[model samples]
Structure formats: C-alpha cells, structure tokens
Target: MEKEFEQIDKSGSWAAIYQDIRHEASDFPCRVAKLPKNKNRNRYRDVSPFDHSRIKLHQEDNDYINASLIKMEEAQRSYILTQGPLPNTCGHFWEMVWEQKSRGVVMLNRVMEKGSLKWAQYWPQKEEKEMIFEDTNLKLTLISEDIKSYYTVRQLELENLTTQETREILHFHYTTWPDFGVPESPASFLNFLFKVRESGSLSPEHGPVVVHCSAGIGRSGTFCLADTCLLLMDKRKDPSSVDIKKVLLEMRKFRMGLIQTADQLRFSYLAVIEGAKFIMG
Candidate 1:
C-alpha cells in the first residue's frame, strides 16, 4: 500500500488529539486513553503529569494474536508487552531504565577536547562536547544533583534553523511519520530517521525518541526492533548483518528480552529483508 501522512495541529490537549485519532481510525485495532489523573503530578516530579498522551496503541488484530496492546512510557525506566486474555500473551516483564525525553527547547553545545595523539583530531568531533540542555527556568531552578539529567548541564544556543535544519532535517523526519490520520510505511519510517540524522535530530543529538504504548513494550519494542534491524542492515552486507543475538542482548540491557513476541522477533528479520530491497536498489 502506498504510504501517506497527514498534519495535525498538536494544539489541543493530548487527550483531544487522541480522541481525534480514535475517531478517525475507528476500525484499526488501536485506541488511545487518558492516563488516570494524579492530583499531585507536576513538571519536576519523577512522574511527569502522565498528563500528555503516554502511549501509542498497536493492537494485534485477530489474525495472529487475538488482541494485544504495546505500551511505551518514558516516565518509567522500562516498558511492558501484554496480550489480552485467553491464548494471549500476558506477564510482568522486567527491563532496564534509560530515560529519553522528547519534548523541549533543547540546546546542543559543542566543545573541543585536545588529544595527545595528533591523528586523533580527525576523529569525528570526539573532542566536540555534545550535550543537550533544557531552555526553561524550571529546569534550571529545580535542578536536582542526584537526578542526573542531560538537560541540566548542556547549553542551548538560540538561532534560526537553516534550510538544512528546517526542510532536510526537521521537516523530513517530523513529517515522515504517519502523523495522526495517515498510514506510515517501513520505508518512510526509515527515511524519517535518515532525515533525523541528516538534521542531527537522532537520539544522540536530539534525544532518545519518546515512544509510548499502553504498556510501553509491545508496539514500542516492535518499532525499536524493526528500526535496529534496519539500521544494522544499512551498515552491514547480507551475510554479515548485525547479530540478531547481539540486538536482543542490547535491548535486554534496558529491558529484558524487550521484543518478546514471535511476531515482534520475526519483524526484526522481516524489516531487514524488506528494508534492504529498497535500500540496496
């Protein structure tokens, strides 16, 4: 199917945006629900107002799994993958906790480190100190020493983003996704990442992608697994692609066997084969 995307204002509350999506993709086996409101949740608390849309719902329709919901939550260090009852997959899985913040006015400050080895200078900006800092006073005023936040130490330079930053980078990846109403393809998915890198918006640069599903594991894991394979295939030749074992191991570092489903694991292989067809051609 030809992939397409539509624009969303992202103006209203996350609940409102989600409702709009549910209304539009009614037939799709996915829906969004508001997190239970916590009266005490605040901006600085460990649990940011689960106020925003906290998950992306990818329902495994009846074909394979009766009904499954994938949950991705940045507020928590790990994610969970659960399938509905009866012949369904369910369990409280454990995983690592590495936080990736998505929204913010961030700044990237570059610093150079001098090396004793003259040739080391050629290393891709190794000395180039890269840190992402938040631009809000709240971040600065309420800094917690033990919290270990990247946004706390980094500096953000305010400047007009150039064409490369605007069209080639930001817009490309930002618009590549299926937005709220359209359908997105694996190619467009990969291309969106390319634009992210082109625009220096990749995780290392922009920050870890903020992905959430109801449980924060299933669909999120599938997306992560698929992206990882696609990345590996792009860097390696057919017979010598990234070791699937290694990928699983790395995922476990953050969450144990994150991509646990048979379908999810199968996608790791499928995405490589499919992505390679277009990438190599």
Candidate 2:
C-alpha cells in the first residue's frame, strides 16, 4: 500500500494524476443548468450539474436544482452529490431529500467560512426548532442534536404539509473541514465516514444519502470516492488489487471533477491506504 503512495510521492506525480482526472472529466452538455431562467438556481456558473445527471425537482415549475445522483455499483453505494443550498433553493434542497426518501444528509462545509457564507442556514440551529419550506410544502423540525468537537449528529423530522406525513432524517455535519481543504487526517475522515455508515443511511435500503459542500465536487467527491474505494477493496479481499485512480475515474462518470486538487488527490490515497489497514487486519 505504501509502495504506490510513496511512488507517487517520489515522482511528485500527484499533480500529474490530478491533471489527468481534470482532463478526462471534460464537459458534457449541461444545457438546462445553464438556461437563463435556471441560472440563479446554481451556486456557481462554472459548477453546473450535467443535463443527463442533475437532479430534477418533481413538483416545481422549473424542475431544476443543482444536485446530482452518484451511484457506485461495485461498492454498493449511492449518493446524491449537490452544492450547498442557496437562500432560494433551501426549500428545493429539502424537497429533493423528501422526494428521494433519503434517510440522511452528509454536509461537509460549514454555513460560513473565510468570512463568507459557504451555504445557507438550511437547518434549524436548536433542538425542537423548525424550518418551513413553503415552496415544497414541507416542514423540517429538529428532534435532537449531539455535538462533538469536530462533528455533529442531529435527528430531524421532515413533514409533508399537504399529507402531514413525517419521517426522521439524520444530519451528519463535519465542522472542521476547511474551505476546499481535506480533513485533519485520513483517519479522522475515515472515522467520520464510519460514523455515517453505522447509521445505514448510505446503504441502498434507503434513498441515496445527500452529500454536499460548496460546489459539491471537491470535498463531496473526496468523501464518496474514499468510501467507495474502501468498500471496493473489502469486496475484492485484496489490498493491492484496488486502484484509487481507477475508482475515482469510475466515480467521475456520475459527476464532474470528483476530486478538485492535487492535494486532495494525495489525501484520497492516504485515506484509502489508512482505512485498508482495518479491513486487512
């Protein structure tokens, strides 16, 4: 495991590897996301989801939101990767979760970072508090909260205003992740990943879990790629057989720019190598 990681380090090929991914992850038609009417729905002009894979809102007149459904069959994993909710799209965000019947949301970025609002305050801050999305006719009320030093666990109730039906949704927030940077360590990130997995939300039994950061391609991609690679290794029962680059390329097919930078590419390798220890031991 260390051999491959050190080989890249010896040649400083992380940058080259990163460029290969960016080059191969070329643009497909994201016509709808770039539509004049739907332009404001996107958080960033350059980060629009593809026309074929972007999540389509069921009830809204526009029927467009900046979200993508990412599925990895070999890993038995499925995730809806998306950008953080904007002030106008928070309702649509919750609506997508509800419509998809997602059991949880994994938020990697904070509401504010580097003196900027990375994402809107889509959830209530306190227990027993609520946020109502009139656009989607849904109400989300916080049932409980458990805060840790670097992460938080919140239990929330989503209610359909029309039918008055409600279901519990788990929210996993990693607070210390810097703006577009990796977690403190691969072990820490894997611990968080394991915590999310323990809830069984990422499993196919429920709707795909929602994963997002600012652009939904950087940290969001890292999370899914790392988790998927770990599962792939376990299934094959071989450490050296798993290829991080190949697995990442496999994931990029579902979304653009799976890992954003060379630094992140290195981190992905470190995490996968570190996590493999547990599986092999």
Candidate 3:
C-alpha cells in the first residue's frame, strides 16, 4: 500500500485526484428539500442537511440541525456528522445526544478558530463546572477532564431532568488540527483516533458517535474516512484491497461535501496508507 502511493506526489496529485472524485461524486443524489429553514437551526447559511440523510429531532418543537447519520455497516461503525451547536441550538444539541443515546462526541474545532467564534461554548468549563439546557431539560456536569498535548478528553455526566436518568459521555476534543489543513503528522492523529476507538464508543453496541468540525463535513469527514479505511484494511488483512475512493463515495451518500478540500482528500489517503502500516505490522 505504501509502495503504491510512494510515487504520487502529495502536492501535485491532490488536485487531480480531488477533481476526479468530485466529478464522480456529483452524480450521487443529494437532492433534499431545504425545509425547516429556521435561522437559529443553522450556524452558517451555506451549510444545511440534505433531506434524504438528515437526522430528525424527535422533539415536537425543534426538528432540524445540520446533522446526518452516517453508518458504515461493513465496518460496524457509525458517526453523526453535525455542525457545531449555535448559541440557541445548544438545547437541541443535547436533546439529540440524549435521545439518540450517543456515548461520545468527537469535536474537531475549537470554540474560537482564526479569530472567529466557530462554535458556541456549549460544554462546561472549569469556572462554570456545569451547564443546564432548560429547553431540553438536560444537565451536563464535568466529572473529570484530562488535557493532553494536542487533545483533551472529558468524562461528562449527563442527566435527564425529565426522566431523572444519568449517563456518562466522553468528549474527545482534538485541539491542534487547523480548520482547512491536515494534521502535522498521521502519528498524532492516529493516536487520537485509537484513543477514541479504545473507549468502545465507536463500536456497534453503542449509538452513533457524534463527529463535527465547523460545517461538519471537512475535518469530520476526513476523520471518519480515514478510520473506516483503516478498519477495512485491518478486517480484510489486505491494505491494497480497500478502495478508499469508493468508501468515501458511499459515505458521501449519507452526508454531502465530505472530505471538503483537495488537501483534505489528499490527507485522507495519506492517513489511510500510513495507518495500514501499523495494521499490517
């Protein structure tokens, strides 16, 4: 697998490969009614869920958030791709997590990125210690937090004020990744990926793990794509047998514009190839 990618120049081949995949992926159906156009539901104007793949909120009042449930049956992995929670949609965000029974959230962006507030401060920080979502009757308390060089892991206690049920949720925040660029090395990224995997949150026994960047497509998609490809290689015991492009296309069926940029697409391939080395060894 590494030998096959050795001659492909990382800088030069990315654009051509990205264009080819986009052309092929354009044919896939993404037509869905842009209904429930509530301004509060979306963080950005251009980011919206496709009708076919959007995750519907079971609550009576709030029906939408730019989120999609992406399931990889063969790999037994599931991810909920969603935009970061806006100020008003914080209640709905916790509602979806409680209702969907998601055990983990993989946040790929910081609250502030590039001098802009990309996401709301939905979680509890040290000063606050806890947060209450009145609209959804959910309470989140910080149980413990461990900060690392490039990521932070928090074990949060989520309680339903309505049902009086409490559960623990793991929050994995990858701190160092840039908004539109790849990680400095696949080593650190894969280490983070394996950390999430070791938690058993991505396993089939649990509900889909929530993954998000800003728009919920670029970095989020790269994370899922690389992890899925690595899992396929590990399962089949043959790195060359996995079709990275095909897997990406299948994933895009659940969410549009996944692996957003040429650099991101290129990085996905690089991560998969690098990951395969560890699996093969």
Candidate 4:
C-alpha cells in the first residue's frame, strides 16, 4: 500500500489518493483513561500514543474512534452516577456541581434509564424523576430506560449509523444471558463498546461516562474493568505484564468483587487478549 501511494502521484485525483492514504494510515487502538484529580490540564499525560494503523483495517472503525476521541478530549468530561428517586435538592445540586466542575456536563441515570416504566414506578416520582439540568451550554443526553432490556449483540453496525436517526447513540451497554457470573451478558456490553469504538464518537469532553444500571457496582465494575483492560491491551499485548485476573481481583477489592464469578473473570480475560483481532485492528 505504501509503495503504491509512492509510485502514483494521483494529484489529479488526490481525493481518491487521500482516501487510500487514510485507509493505509488508520490501524490503531482506542485509548481511554481517567483524569487524575487535579486542576492542571496536562498533569495526566496520554502514555498511549495514537497508532494510525490499528483501526485502519476497518475504515469505519478508524473514523469513529478518531472523531470520537477528539470530541471527548476537547470537552471537559465528568460522569454523573445517579440511582433511585433523586431529591429536588440533590438533583439541583448536581447541576450546580456540573457548573463548577466542568465546562459542560452529561449525566447517566442509573435507575430511570435502566428500567421500564413499571420499574421506574418503584423509583422516584415522575415529576422528580426527570433530569432538571437542561442548559444550552451543558449538553445533556440520556439513554432510554429500554436499553437494559434491548441488548442483543451486533444488531446494529457502523454503516447503519451513517444515517441521521441512529446517530445519537455514541456508546452502547448490554448484559449476557447466562447468569452464572464470569460476566453476565458480555456480548451486550461489548455491543455498546464496539459501537463507541467503531463510531469513534467518544471524546474526553463528552465523558467520564457513568455506566450503571442499579448500584453502579457489580456489573458496572465489570464493565469498567473490561474497558480498562481493552485499553491497556491496546498499549501492551503482554497478558503477563498486566495479569488480567490479578487486575480484576484488585478492582473487586476496592469496587466490590468485580469479575466475581469464575466465568466472568474468564470472559474478561478472553475479551481483552484473545478478542483483540476481531474488533481491534
């Protein structure tokens, strides 16, 4: 591919050449990290250098991650973890916190968005249930309550997203069926992450996204670990260096036994290391 580009100076059809150049240059991994609790912007450096080739094999994947990351970094990102019936004061308080902590804010509702209307009936009252932080400067996007039940892996693809209606979803989350425990519903969760990676819609400015359904613990912790492992693997392929099992064990210690079931831990291990070639370039 490199030689072909060098030989053909398609200046007359530079657009075509440019497209090929982009394809050749696209393969790379998606890197997402947490910002240290500090004021200085550059205090946390991205040790992961952007690899132009990782996602390039899938042109759609390359474009998605690239565009998404750019948007995320530019926006001051923070995650809002909310569950149950939120008090008026508490709801308003988060708004104030957003005003103080970030340039803009995006919230993830753990209860209302994770359950059906009937389930939500068991939550806070409707009037109190709806989010109150709607401001032009503060962009608020909400995942519908239906997502918890609607997950099936790869039902949607990047090409389908090129259209207008489906474009709003930047990332997706799903649960696996067999409840034995390695990680329940791994496919559903990956369905979401894969879209985020493929669409490349993630930008630092857009998140420190809050991924939660109920307690924002168990499954959430597992999901977080899975994502972190994927990013880590992208930088370093050595499973021995990171010891996927050990890392999840540590995460479980602090965040309540993540990868609690043997099956869950095994799935996590497989997804990060073995699963790289499938979705990752």
Position 257, candidate 1: lDDT: 28
The residue ranges of model 1 lying beyond 4 angstroms of the native Cα positions read: 1-199, 236-239
Q: Please identify which of the two predictions, 1 or 3, would achieve the higher TM-score against the true structure.
A: 3
Per-residue CA lDDT of candidate 1, range 170-202, in tens? 111122222122223455444433433443443
Q: For residues 45-89, write the lDDT of model 2, one tens digit per residue.
A: 878787877888899498999988887877788899999888999
* TM-score of structure candidate 3: 0.93
**Models ranked on lDDT:** 2, 3, 4, 1
lDDT tens per residue, model 4, 189-240: 5665665445443344443443443333445545556566665555665633
Provide the TM-score for each candidate, comma-separated: 0.34, 0.96, 0.93, 0.43
Could you tell me which 10 consecutive residues in candidate 4 have the lowest summed lDDT? 65-74
Best by TM-score: 2
- Candidate 3, 44: how far from true, in Å? 2.4
Model 3 Cα displacement at 94 (Å)?
1.1
Which scores greater on lDDT, model 1 or model 3?
A: 3
Better of 3 and 4 by TM-score: 3
Writing each residue's lDDT as its tens digit, candidate 3 over 1-281 gives 56546555643676787778777773333233245557667777666677777788887875777788888988878889999888898888888888889999998887887676555788898736689999889999988899999899999999999999999999999988865567757787888898999998897877899999888988899899999998888887555689888999888778778888887877788888878777668
- Is candidate 1 or 2 superior in lDDT? 2
Candidate 2 similarity to native, TM-score: 0.96
The per-model lDDT (C-alpha) reads 0.30, 0.86, 0.82, 0.35
The number of clashing residue pairs in each candidate reads: 15, 0, 0, 31
